[PDB]
Design a protein around this ligand. Structure first.
Ligand SMILES: NC(=O)C1=CN([C@@H]2O[C@H](COP(=O)(O)OP(=O)(O)OC[C@H]3O[C@@H](n4cnc5c(N)ncnc54)[C@H](OP(=O)(O)O)[C@@H]3O)[C@@H](O)[C@H]2O)C=CC1
Lengths: 414, 369
């Protein structure tokens, strides 16, 4: 469909209220005046494409997901993956926890063991102090929930106080930074040490979210053995990303083609999600692929699963200022942060699935066979003028290999 | 002329000050003054299912001094204080002589993964013995790049034991001003048949790698203590605390993630402005951060007590581009490159690397002060 036909179709689907639909048809943008409130030294605005990924089925609810990407084929891939996985029942997703982590680092602590025990014994008192430093969140039902103290040996040694905070629908960088700043004096007195910093942590292991899918082999190919072969290769591709960091970077980049597209569309901080997830990818001592694809040979199903820190937000940042971000949240039915996180996780896994399927699939047939035959021609030692006759003979056979290329090369020259 | 007063100037006055700097041609200045955006029609050719466009702020970071050359850096970010921090850091570091940056190598890596190789050692030697023949085969698969002076330069083979074992053929390719995903993927498709024949194995995939360790770029600065504070000794204390914060990021992954995020507030901002793939740079760099077995901070700040200097350094994979993709289709991306003086990709990599370190400096300074 054309651009305009896409708008008519979206209008007929009634996914947007009449006002939002009109806004989108006028392609309403954040104004320079509002942009001037989001950033500094603003001299204009910058536009990217805004696309829709239909039929994203998460926990039995179907969504049309907005994407902002400049990379060709990314949206098409996500739509393709979503369609297949919808046939296979959609995604199942869950939030394990949703809390943000902040830390105060202390140094020059003469007696770290005692300091650790003193601080741990004042846990409730210190959590009450953080809550009083930012009193709005407790009134609204959130707040600082836990505290842990760790010694980190090295050059020099650090004593690190971590707080775990329920920030509800917000990202909470300012909340944690305010709470941590209030804790510094008492943490110094309790430890008799020096406060180095108090800052939120983007290694958001209190906000893990998991999505999965289960794809019968028949959705991968009609030829019974073929679908199994595609599934087997996708699992092998997932295993390869576990073995080679050079593959892992590309595997995970492919996930974030999708994730970053919907983060931008929803006003979320993708540098934060990227950092937390790529750090999560090396928690076992090696940088590895973030998702796992495995075979269910008994059920003949390909199983995909991906766990990430996904501390996204539905309030704050530009979510209220950029009008198209507001439209994106409306388009999704105004999900909570937890629901949004589960949608984003599914999208990331969908994006990954389309990449792996394309990576492992072979045989352009008509054109691929001439590519194959020319490579074998050259390896056989064909010179420049011999290549075209060679390829022509090869591709005209039911099958061929290097030995065929070499034998025909000898016929050519003899 | 001076950039003083630029942040407090109105939008209209900022544009006038930019005009006074004579950084842009009449057409580009006009384009910016009308805030010209990529149209829906052009967007419709860059992506699929397009139903509109999405706008973000566009800002300038002036006085970025890299290898004796001064730049006005464009930023696209939605996070308050990011542009201000980068501008603050850049001015201080310009006072301190600016950045020194160098490109160690500029090549892309692609890989073919082979499995079911009965004799990996033999396959490894057979493949190595046809190296020159394989490199020429790859170059003929994408002959336009060779006409421009690039192409496949090297090829090596590794056994990666595991479940199962893989035999991996890596190619190292000079992609010139492009990122070269299509170039490498095309060469790799051509290599699959012959690599399978040589190895007597099965090709699993042939794809470029975003772990771009053949494209490392290093940037550094040396900031006298007196540029960190007017009160003198306070400057040394700030230097000491920034070095400590850098060390904390070597010790705790919970800190390293935030440290590295803070770097990419800046890097991704200029990547978007120049039409480059920020997922690719993010992935390779975060992968680089755990090369020593632990996820660690990507930059190092150290005290030079003897010279009374705070020293900053950062090495990253930075395979950025000046040709291809949306580069040139989005009118503001074309404008961003003109704004930088149309740097080569190598030059741009050095500017971006410097920007990331500048951003990092402002984050750490604000954190410990
Ligand atoms: N994991 C990944 O990163 C992957 C990314 N991509 C996406 O593809 C794009 C990057 O791939 P890429 O191959 O670089 O882009 P292109 O496919 O568009 O190829 C680059 C084009 O620029 C031309 N050109 C002009 N000058 C030069 C020069 N000095 N050096 C090289 N080329 C020049 C080339 O030659 P000419 O016009 O004369 O033929 C060619 O047409 C990005 O959008 C990326 O996101 C795609 C697949 C995988």
């Amino acid at each position: 469909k054309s651009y305009q036909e896409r708008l008519e179709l979206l209008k007929a689907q009634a996914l947007l209220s009449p006002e939002r639909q009109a806004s989108l048809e006028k392609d309403e943008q954040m104004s320079v005046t509002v942009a001037d409130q989001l950033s500094e030294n603003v001299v204009g605005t910058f536009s990217l494409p805004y696309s829709l990924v239909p039929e994203v089925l998460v926990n039995g609810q179907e969504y049309t997901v907005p994407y902002v990407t400049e990379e060709p084929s990314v949206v098409a891939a996500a739509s393709y993956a979503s369609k297949i996985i919808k046939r296979a029942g959609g995604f199942t997703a869950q939030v394990h926890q949703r809390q943000m982590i902040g830390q105060v680092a202390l140094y020059q602590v003469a007696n770290p063991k005692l300091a650790q025990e003193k601080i741990a014994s004042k846990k409730a008192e210190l959590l009450e102090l953080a809550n009083q430093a930012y009193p709005s969140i407790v009134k609204r039902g959130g707040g600082a929930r836990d505290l842990h103290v760790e010694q980190i040996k090295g050059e020099p040694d650090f004593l690190v106080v971590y707080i775990h905070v329920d920030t509800q629908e917000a990202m909470g960088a300012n909340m944690l930074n305010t709470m941590l700043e209030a804790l510094k004096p008492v943490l110094e007195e309790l430890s008799q040490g020096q406060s180095l910093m108090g800052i939120l942590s983007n290694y958001a292991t209190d906000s893990l979210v998991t999505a999965s899918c289960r794809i019968a082999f028949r959705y991968l190919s009609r030829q019974k053995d073929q679908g199994r072969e595609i599934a087997e290769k996708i699992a092998l591709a997932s295993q390869f990303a576990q073995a080679d960091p050079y593959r892992a970077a590309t595997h995970n980049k492919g996930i974030f083609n999708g994730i970053d597209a919907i983060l931008i569309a929803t006003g979320n901080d993708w540098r934060a999600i990227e950092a937390g997830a790529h750090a999560f990818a090396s928690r076992d001592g090696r940088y590895q692929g973030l998702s796992c694809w495995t075979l269910d040979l008994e059920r003949e199903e390909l199983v995909g699963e991906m766990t990430l820190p996904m501390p996204v937000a539905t309030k704050g940042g530009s979510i209220g200022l950029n009008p198209r971000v507001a439209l994106s949240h409306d388009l999704l039915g105004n999900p909570s942060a937890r629901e949004l996180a589960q949608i984003i996780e599914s999208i990331g896994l969908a994006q990954n699935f389309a990449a792996l399927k394309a990576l492992v699939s072979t045989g352009i047939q008509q054109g691929h066979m001439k590519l194959q035959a020319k490579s074998l021609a050259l390896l056989a030692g064909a010179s420049e003028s011999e290549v075209a006759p060679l390829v022509e003979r090869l591709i005209s056979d039911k099958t061929f290999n290097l030995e065929t290329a070499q034998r025909y090369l000898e016929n050519l020259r003899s």
